[PDB]
Design a protein around this ligand. Structure first.
Ligand SMILES: C[C@@H](Oc1ccc(Br)cc1)C(N)=O
Length: 191
């Protein structure tokens, strides 16, 4: 309690809370992230383990962020992987390509070529990349950026109402600690 996160400093209370897509008894958690964001990369093992530990207690999703036109292909990539059902399999290698191999995967052809080395059929991937369904999800993700007033990554949103992230806590461990506190406060009907 004396060490509890401080509202307005360690997390932000949104003036316009957003609809929650989680069912009763689950806390919704959203991570806005960008494949090219170093803190998002570093945070992956931390948030993966925490989400897996919560299990059915939460409904977790990621939303890709393209702050610039040049990075819209990274949001298309995110939704194309999900459409193919290979996200869990290849996403570590995608992060590795960008952050360690200097392959920024900025075009659909570079993505397809890389993903083929990971066992993804290029025609299937490019069909997903260019599909109307993925284009719809990308346009939606940009509307979500606006609706949650997101101006940095990674940003974690709890129950459509509480935002945290290293912009707030100045550390990834602090982000995880605030997230855990927020979810517990929502479960206990304190937030
Ligand atoms: C890790 C790498 O940073 C980048 C991340 C995404 C993009 Br796109 C371009 C560069 C670096 N040069 O240290």
């Amino acid at each position: 309690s004396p060490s509890a996160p401080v509202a307005g400093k360690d997390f932000e209370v949104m003036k316009s809370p957003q609809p929650v897509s989680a069912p009763a008894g689950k806390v919704e958690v959203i991570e806005f992230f960008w494949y090219g964001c170093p803190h998002c990369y570093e945070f992956e093992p931390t948030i993966e383990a925490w989400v897996k530990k919560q299990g059915d207690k939460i409904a977790f999703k990621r939303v890709p962020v393209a702050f610039r036109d040049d990075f819209v292909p990274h949001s298309k990539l995110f939704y194309a992987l999900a459409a193919l059902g290979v996200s869990e399999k290849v996403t570590p290698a995608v992060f590795n390509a960008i952050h360690k191999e200097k392959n920024y995967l900025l075009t659909p052809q570079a993505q397809a070529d890389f993903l083929a080395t990971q066992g993804v059929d290029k025609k299937k991937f490019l069909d997903a990349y260019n599909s109307f369904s993925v284009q719809g999800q990308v346009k939606q993700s940009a509307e979500l950026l606006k609706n949650y007033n997101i101006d940095g990554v990674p940003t974690i949103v709890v129950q459509g109402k509480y935002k945290t992230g290293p912009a707030y806590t100045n550390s990834l461990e602090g982000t995880a600690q605030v997230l855990d506190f927020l979810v517990k406060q929502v479960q206990d009907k304190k937030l």
